[PDB]
Design an enzyme around this catalytic site. Structure first.
Site, PDB file in Angstrom:
ATOM      1  N   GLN A  96     -83.959 -47.971  13.045  1.00  0.00           N
ATOM      2  CA  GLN A  96     -84.762 -47.285  14.053  1.00  0.00           C
ATOM      3  C   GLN A  96     -86.275 -47.543  13.890  1.00  0.00           C
ATOM      4  O   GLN A  96     -86.829 -47.454  12.780  1.00  0.00           O
ATOM      5  CB  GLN A  96     -84.464 -45.771  14.017  1.00  0.00           C
ATOM      6  CG  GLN A  96     -85.210 -44.991  15.118  1.00  0.00           C
ATOM      7  CD  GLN A  96     -84.684 -43.574  15.313  1.00  0.00           C
ATOM      8  OE1 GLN A  96     -83.967 -43.023  14.450  1.00  0.00           O
ATOM      9  NE2 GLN A  96     -85.062 -42.963  16.440  1.00  0.00           N
ATOM     10  N   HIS A 102     -82.904 -43.103  22.153  1.00  0.00           N
ATOM     11  CA  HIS A 102     -82.664 -44.111  23.187  1.00  0.00           C
ATOM     12  C   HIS A 102     -81.355 -44.827  22.956  1.00  0.00           C
ATOM     13  O   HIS A 102     -80.923 -45.036  21.797  1.00  0.00           O
ATOM     14  CB  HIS A 102     -83.800 -45.150  23.286  1.00  0.00           C
ATOM     15  CG  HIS A 102     -84.194 -45.777  21.979  1.00  0.00           C
ATOM     16  ND1 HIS A 102     -84.930 -45.114  21.016  1.00  0.00           N
ATOM     17  CD2 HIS A 102     -83.995 -47.029  21.494  1.00  0.00           C
ATOM     18  CE1 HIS A 102     -85.172 -45.929  20.001  1.00  0.00           C
ATOM     19  NE2 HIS A 102     -84.608 -47.097  20.264  1.00  0.00           N
ATOM     20  N   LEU A 103     -80.741 -45.209  24.072  1.00  0.00           N
ATOM     21  CA  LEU A 103     -79.523 -45.999  24.081  1.00  0.00           C
ATOM     22  C   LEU A 103     -79.860 -47.440  24.500  1.00  0.00           C
ATOM     23  O   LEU A 103     -80.362 -47.660  25.607  1.00  0.00           O
ATOM     24  CB  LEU A 103     -78.535 -45.367  25.069  1.00  0.00           C
ATOM     25  CG  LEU A 103     -77.151 -45.986  25.221  1.00  0.00           C
ATOM     26  CD1 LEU A 103     -76.283 -45.677  23.958  1.00  0.00           C
ATOM     27  CD2 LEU A 103     -76.480 -45.452  26.502  1.00  0.00           C
TER      28      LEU A 103
HETATM   29  N1  LIG Z   1     -93.483 -51.041  25.189  1.00  0.00           N
HETATM   30  C1  LIG Z   1     -92.149 -51.266  25.122  1.00  0.00           C
HETATM   31  N2  LIG Z   1     -91.394 -51.528  26.223  1.00  0.00           N
HETATM   32  C2  LIG Z   1     -90.060 -51.780  26.195  1.00  0.00           C
HETATM   33  N3  LIG Z   1     -89.371 -51.798  25.045  1.00  0.00           N
HETATM   34  C3  LIG Z   1     -90.003 -51.515  23.877  1.00  0.00           C
HETATM   35  C4  LIG Z   1     -91.445 -51.230  23.829  1.00  0.00           C
HETATM   36  N4  LIG Z   1     -91.797 -51.013  22.532  1.00  0.00           N
HETATM   37  C5  LIG Z   1     -90.658 -51.120  21.814  1.00  0.00           C
HETATM   38  N5  LIG Z   1     -89.606 -51.454  22.607  1.00  0.00           N
HETATM   39  C6  LIG Z   1     -88.214 -51.669  22.155  1.00  0.00           C
HETATM   40  O1  LIG Z   1     -87.728 -50.438  21.623  1.00  0.00           O
HETATM   41  C7  LIG Z   1     -86.716 -50.692  20.633  1.00  0.00           C
HETATM   42  C8  LIG Z   1     -87.073 -49.799  19.429  1.00  0.00           C
HETATM   43  O2  LIG Z   1     -86.342 -50.116  18.207  1.00  0.00           O
HETATM   44  P1  LIG Z   1     -85.126 -49.161  17.718  1.00  0.00           P
HETATM   45  O3  LIG Z   1     -85.778 -47.804  17.542  1.00  0.00           O
HETATM   46  O4  LIG Z   1     -84.543 -49.836  16.481  1.00  0.00           O
HETATM   47  O5  LIG Z   1     -84.078 -49.041  18.748  1.00  0.00           O
HETATM   48  C9  LIG Z   1     -86.808 -52.182  20.295  1.00  0.00           C
HETATM   49  O6  LIG Z   1     -85.667 -52.902  20.837  1.00  0.00           O
HETATM   50  C10 LIG Z   1     -88.118 -52.604  20.947  1.00  0.00           C
HETATM   51  O7  LIG Z   1     -88.180 -53.992  21.325  1.00  0.00           O
END
Ligand SMILES: Nc1ncnc2c1ncn2[C@@H]1O[C@H](COP(=O)(O)O)[C@@H](O)[C@H]1O
EC number: 3.9.1.-
Lengths: 116, 112
Positions: A96, A102-103
């Site tokens: 994370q 988030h999904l």
């Molecule tokens: N500004 C943004 N817009 C869209 N996706 C994002 C943004 N910042 C982070 N993410 C995505 O959010 C996810 C966060 O990581 P995780 O918490 O492991 O699911 C990752 O797949 C990132 O690429």
């Protein structure tokens, strides 16, 4: 305490940071991931700020299920007719990075096993 | 049609059950991909997430809440990954909806 909080995703909810939005309702938002790991890769998030699934409350059940129902409807709307994978990452071992629930929904290629 | 997960719910074949209530069952995966790897499944036979109905929302959310509670009880204090597979591309192995919960090691990216 701005509604939705000040994580990346709280800012996206309040239109303060840009996003490519697929679907929005009163409960949730679906938008494309900025670092896609499959030909289609999007996120479904609640508007209510919950930091991580490990702290979700019992009364959050409907909302969490809604994320999955919206995720599967968005996948159909995007033509993912051969299928897709839904993922929730919790904490360090889950990988994370953003502490707002988030999904992930990934598709448009064959997904492999194990899922990381 | 019936599946091996239906047989598990009906107690016709054995599984290492972690938790049960009136609407779901959690049990260890027979082919584990991490030191802890279990499934949470509804007792209702929803064949795949793509055919779930709007009125299944809170049942699906119940799988996740039960999943996170079982994870804490199994000592996954450093975190875990939840996964639902749909169809061929998703790698779905049994046509009965199931939530994977994996932990006890670093989970990697991409998630397959
Ligand atoms: N500004 C943004 N817009 C869209 N996706 C994002 C943004 N910042 C982070 N993410 C995505 O959010 C996810 C966060 O990581 P995780 O918490 O492991 O699911 C990752 O797949 C990132 O690429």
């Amino acid at each position: 305490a701005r509604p939705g909080g000040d994580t990346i995703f709280g800012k996206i909810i309040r239109k303060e940071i840009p996003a490519k939005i697929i679907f929005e309702d009163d409960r949730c938002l679906a938008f494309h991931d900025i670092s896609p790991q499959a030909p289609t890769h999007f996120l479904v998030i609640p508007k209510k700020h919950i930091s991580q699934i490990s702290v979700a409350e019992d009364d959050d059940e409907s909302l969490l299920g809604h994320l999955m129902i919206v995720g599967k409807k968005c996948a159909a709307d995007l033509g993912l007719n051969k299928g897709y994978r839904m993922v929730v990452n919790e904490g360090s071992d889950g990988g994370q990075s953003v502490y707002h629930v988030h999904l992930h929904v990934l598709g448009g290629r064959q997904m492999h096993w194990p899922p990381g």
